mmCIF file of the C-alpha atoms, coordinates in Angstrom:
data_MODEL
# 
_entry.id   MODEL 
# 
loop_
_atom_site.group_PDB 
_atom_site.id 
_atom_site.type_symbol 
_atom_site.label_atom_id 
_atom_site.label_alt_id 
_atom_site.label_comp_id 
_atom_site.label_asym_id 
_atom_site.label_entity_id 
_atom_site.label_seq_id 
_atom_site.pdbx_PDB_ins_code 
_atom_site.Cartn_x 
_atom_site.Cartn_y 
_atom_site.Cartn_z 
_atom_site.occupancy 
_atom_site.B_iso_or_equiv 
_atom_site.pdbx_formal_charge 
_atom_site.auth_seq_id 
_atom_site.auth_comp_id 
_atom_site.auth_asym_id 
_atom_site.auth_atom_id 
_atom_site.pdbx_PDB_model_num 
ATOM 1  C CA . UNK A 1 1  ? -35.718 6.379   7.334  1.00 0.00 ? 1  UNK A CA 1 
ATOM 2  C CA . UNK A 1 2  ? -34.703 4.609   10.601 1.00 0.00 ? 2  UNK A CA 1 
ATOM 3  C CA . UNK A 1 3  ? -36.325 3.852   13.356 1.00 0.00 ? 3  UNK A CA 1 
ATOM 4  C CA . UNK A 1 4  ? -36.258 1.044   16.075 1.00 0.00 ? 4  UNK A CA 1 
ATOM 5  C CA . UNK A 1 5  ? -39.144 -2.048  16.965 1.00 0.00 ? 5  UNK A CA 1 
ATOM 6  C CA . UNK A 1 6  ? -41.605 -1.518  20.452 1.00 0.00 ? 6  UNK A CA 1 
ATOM 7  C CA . UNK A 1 7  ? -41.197 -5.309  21.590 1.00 0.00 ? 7  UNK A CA 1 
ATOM 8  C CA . UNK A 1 8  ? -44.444 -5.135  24.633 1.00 0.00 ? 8  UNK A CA 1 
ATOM 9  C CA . UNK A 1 9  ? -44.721 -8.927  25.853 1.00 0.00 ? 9  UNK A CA 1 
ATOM 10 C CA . UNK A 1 10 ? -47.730 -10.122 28.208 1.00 0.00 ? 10 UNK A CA 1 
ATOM 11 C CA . UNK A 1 11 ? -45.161 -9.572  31.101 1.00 0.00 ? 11 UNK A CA 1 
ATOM 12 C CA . UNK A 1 12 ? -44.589 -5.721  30.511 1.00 0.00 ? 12 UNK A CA 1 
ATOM 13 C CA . UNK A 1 13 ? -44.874 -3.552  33.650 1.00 0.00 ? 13 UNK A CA 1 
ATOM 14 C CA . UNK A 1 14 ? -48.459 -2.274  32.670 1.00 0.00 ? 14 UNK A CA 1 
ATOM 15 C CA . UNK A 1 15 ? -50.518 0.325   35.276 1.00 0.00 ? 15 UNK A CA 1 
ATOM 16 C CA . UNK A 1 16 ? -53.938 -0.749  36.619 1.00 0.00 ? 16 UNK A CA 1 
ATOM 17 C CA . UNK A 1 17 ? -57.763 0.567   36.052 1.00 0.00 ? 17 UNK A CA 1 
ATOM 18 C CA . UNK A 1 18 ? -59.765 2.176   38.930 1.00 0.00 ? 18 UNK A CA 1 
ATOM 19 C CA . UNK A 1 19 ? -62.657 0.594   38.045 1.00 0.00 ? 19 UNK A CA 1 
ATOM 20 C CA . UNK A 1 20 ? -64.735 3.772   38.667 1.00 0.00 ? 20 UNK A CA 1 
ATOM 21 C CA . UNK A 1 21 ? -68.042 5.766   36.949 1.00 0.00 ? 21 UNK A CA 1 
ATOM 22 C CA . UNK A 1 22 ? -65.620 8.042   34.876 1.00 0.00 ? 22 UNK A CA 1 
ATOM 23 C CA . UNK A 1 23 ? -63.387 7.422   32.032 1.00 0.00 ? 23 UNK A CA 1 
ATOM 24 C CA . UNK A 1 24 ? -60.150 9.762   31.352 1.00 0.00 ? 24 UNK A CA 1 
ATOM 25 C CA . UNK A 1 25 ? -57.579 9.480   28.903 1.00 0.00 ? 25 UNK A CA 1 
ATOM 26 C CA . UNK A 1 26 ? -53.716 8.945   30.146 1.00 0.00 ? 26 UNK A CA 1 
ATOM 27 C CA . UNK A 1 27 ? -50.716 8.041   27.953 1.00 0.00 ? 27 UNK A CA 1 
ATOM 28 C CA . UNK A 1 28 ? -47.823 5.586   29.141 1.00 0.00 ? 28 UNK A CA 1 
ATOM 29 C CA . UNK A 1 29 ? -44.218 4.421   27.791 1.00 0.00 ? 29 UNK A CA 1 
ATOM 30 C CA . UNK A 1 30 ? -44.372 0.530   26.750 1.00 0.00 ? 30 UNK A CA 1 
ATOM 31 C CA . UNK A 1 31 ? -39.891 0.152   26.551 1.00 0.00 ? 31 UNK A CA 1 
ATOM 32 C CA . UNK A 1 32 ? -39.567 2.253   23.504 1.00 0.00 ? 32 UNK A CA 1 
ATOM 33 C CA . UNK A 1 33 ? -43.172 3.291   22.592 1.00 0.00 ? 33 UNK A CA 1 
ATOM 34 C CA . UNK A 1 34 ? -45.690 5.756   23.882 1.00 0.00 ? 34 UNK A CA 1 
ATOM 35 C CA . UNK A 1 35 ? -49.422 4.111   24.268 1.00 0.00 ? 35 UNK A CA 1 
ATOM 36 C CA . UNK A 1 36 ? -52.677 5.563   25.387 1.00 0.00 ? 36 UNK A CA 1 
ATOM 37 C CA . UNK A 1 37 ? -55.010 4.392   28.548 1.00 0.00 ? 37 UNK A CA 1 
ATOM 38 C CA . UNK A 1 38 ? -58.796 4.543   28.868 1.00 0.00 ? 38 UNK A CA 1 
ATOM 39 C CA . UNK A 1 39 ? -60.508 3.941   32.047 1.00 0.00 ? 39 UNK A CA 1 
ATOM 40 C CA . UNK A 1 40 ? -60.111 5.628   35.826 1.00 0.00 ? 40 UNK A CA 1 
ATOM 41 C CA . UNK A 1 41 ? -56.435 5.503   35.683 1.00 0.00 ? 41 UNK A CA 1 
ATOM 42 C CA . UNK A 1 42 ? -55.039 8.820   36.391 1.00 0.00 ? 42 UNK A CA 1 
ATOM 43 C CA . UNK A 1 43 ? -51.292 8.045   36.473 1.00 0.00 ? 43 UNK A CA 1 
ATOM 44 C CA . UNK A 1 44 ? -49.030 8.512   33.597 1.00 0.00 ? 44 UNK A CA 1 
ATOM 45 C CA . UNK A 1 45 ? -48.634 11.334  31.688 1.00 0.00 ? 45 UNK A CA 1 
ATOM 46 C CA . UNK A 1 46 ? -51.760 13.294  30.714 1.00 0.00 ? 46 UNK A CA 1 
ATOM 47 C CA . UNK A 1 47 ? -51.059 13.634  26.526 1.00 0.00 ? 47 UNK A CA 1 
ATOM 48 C CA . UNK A 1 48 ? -49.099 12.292  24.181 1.00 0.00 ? 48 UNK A CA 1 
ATOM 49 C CA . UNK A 1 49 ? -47.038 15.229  23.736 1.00 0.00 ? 49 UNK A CA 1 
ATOM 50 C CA . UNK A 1 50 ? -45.417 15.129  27.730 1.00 0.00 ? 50 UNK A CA 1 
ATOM 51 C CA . UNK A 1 51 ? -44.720 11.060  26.872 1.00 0.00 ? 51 UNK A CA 1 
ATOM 52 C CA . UNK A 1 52 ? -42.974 11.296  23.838 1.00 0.00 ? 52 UNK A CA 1 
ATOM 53 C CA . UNK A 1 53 ? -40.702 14.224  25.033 1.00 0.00 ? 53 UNK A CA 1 
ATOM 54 C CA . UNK A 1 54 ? -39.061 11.823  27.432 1.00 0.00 ? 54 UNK A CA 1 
ATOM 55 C CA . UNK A 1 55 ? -39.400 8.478   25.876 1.00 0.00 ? 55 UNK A CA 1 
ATOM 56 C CA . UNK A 1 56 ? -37.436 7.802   22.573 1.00 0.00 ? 56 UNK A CA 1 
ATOM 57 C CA . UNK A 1 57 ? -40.653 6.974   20.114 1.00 0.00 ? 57 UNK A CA 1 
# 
């Protein structure tokens, strides 16, 4: 098969936590990879399914 690498340094563009009493789950893009976020963050798209539609991975 073929496929490509999901290089995600320190320096990324990553969103922020809302630091509230509930805990969702979100999914991001990380360059070439879709990833998924835990904690009062709202943004992003809400499964996996609506990130890896756009993004290439």
């Amino acid at each position: 098969g073929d496929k490509e690498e999901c290089t995600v340094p320190i320096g990324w563009s990553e969103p922020v936590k809302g630091l509230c009493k509930a805990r969702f789950t979100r999914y991001y893009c990380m360059g070439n990879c879709c990833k998924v976020y835990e904690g009062c963050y709202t943004g992003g798209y809400s499964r996996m399914g609506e990130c890896a539609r756009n993004c290439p991975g």
